Design brief:
This protein folds into two domains: about 170 residues, Acid Proteases (Cathepsin D, subunit A, domain 1, Beta Barrel), CATH 2.40.70; about 160 residues, Acid Proteases (Cathepsin D, subunit A, domain 1, Beta Barrel), CATH 2.40.70. The protein is mainly beta. The two termini are about 25 Å apart. It contains four helices and 24 strands. The strands form three sheets. It has a seven-stranded mixed β-sheet with strand order 18-17-12-13-22-14-21. A six-stranded mixed β-barrel has the order 2-3-8-4-7-6.
Length: about 325
């Protein structure tokens, strides 16, 4: 089997991407944030504290003839950005782009943090990291991909995120029309439960490529590109007037600037992030200070190849017995 679904930016900055997901019978369609950095499929629901729902579409398990309470199961998650959610668990039928999993754990939120409430466009998350990170207790549950994998034509999914435009998540096949040149594959460590890999270096604008190993995670659920302070300083030094602002929480730059591109290495291959992908707009409405899309990972504890990087590529998440990651230009 295969599946193919369009993923759409939630706003004009590409702060996140939402993908429609069918849950239950009859189908209830929710727009979920596909997150290769976590491993829980959780949704706003009829059980969510009423004051914490503000415009989201909810899953109502009592209206699904295929929903079953997973007795005794609870979940609770905290994300790197400080947001969190928790609740109980149902199993139900879940379909993405025509690919159906029966008996998928659907984690129903009883509580969500303010950041989730305040974002009316995201109805929940669909985790695509390794199932070892799933938070359901006392019996850990499998991701949608893990459940689908054996049935797929090939045990892969691909992320093709757009810049200020829709893109695609495919399951079970590689669309050879969706990229240019070849896909370069690189090794993955699953030791921390992430799609963790090592970039071979970087360049700023038309500058020389610096060969250096940068360990990090391919994370569709993180907006920005978080890299070591040395790398980030080298980038922003090429933007007149750019500076790190402790008050704002990262590098800012004059909105009048033209940003240089940023290249990262995948083996001997190179992925070029155009300068405009690194612009996250005014820090507050009407400001002429703009927020940068490349930020320091210092004190995150891990480098993160978030959407800023991934949207410059066609990305293969290869879930073979020994997983790997593939990157192509597009």
């Amino acid at each position: 089997s295969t599946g193919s679904a369009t993923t759409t930016p939630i706003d004009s900055l590409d702060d996140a991407y939402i993908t429609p997901v069918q849950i239950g019978t009859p189908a209830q369609t929710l727009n979920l944030d596909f997150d290769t950095g976590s491993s829980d499929l959780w949704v706003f629901s009829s059980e969510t504290t009423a004051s914490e729902v503000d415009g989201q579409t909810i899953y109502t398990p009592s209206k699904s003839t295929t929903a079953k309470l997973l007795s005794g199961a609870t979940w609770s998650i905290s994300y790197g950005d400080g947001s969190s959610s928790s609740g109980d668990v149902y199993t139900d039928t879940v379909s993405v782009g025509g690919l159906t999993v029966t008996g998928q754990a659907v984690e129903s939120a009883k509580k969500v943090s303010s950041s989730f409430t305040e974002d009316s466009t995201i109805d929940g998350l669909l985790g695509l990291a390794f199932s070892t990170l799933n938070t359901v207790s006392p019996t850990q549950q499998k991701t949608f991909f893990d459940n689908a994998k054996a049935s797929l034509d090939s045990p892969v999914f691909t992320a093709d995120l757009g810049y200020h435009a829709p893109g695609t998540y495919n399951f079970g096949f590689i669309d050879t029309t969706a990229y240019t040149g070849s896909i370069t594959y690189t090794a993955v460590s699953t030791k921390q439960g992430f799609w963790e890999w090592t970039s071979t270096g970087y360049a700023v604008g038309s500058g020389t490529f610096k060969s250096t190993s940068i360990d990090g995670i391919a994370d569709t659920g993180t907006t920005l590109l978080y890299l070591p302070a040395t790398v980030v300083s080298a980038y922003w030094a090429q933007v007149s007037g750019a500076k790190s602002s402790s008050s704002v929480g990262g590098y800012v730059f004059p909105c009048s600037a033209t940003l240089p591109s940023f290249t990262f290495g995948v083996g001997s291959a190179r992925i070029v992030i155009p300068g405009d992908y690194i612009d996250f707009g005014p820090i507050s409405t009407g400001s002429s200070s703009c927020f940068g899309g490349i930020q320091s990972s210092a004190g995150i504890g891990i480098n993160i190849f978030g959407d800023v990087a991934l949207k410059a590529a066609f990305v293969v998440f290869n879930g073979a017995t020994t997983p790997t990651l593939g990157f192509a230009s597009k």
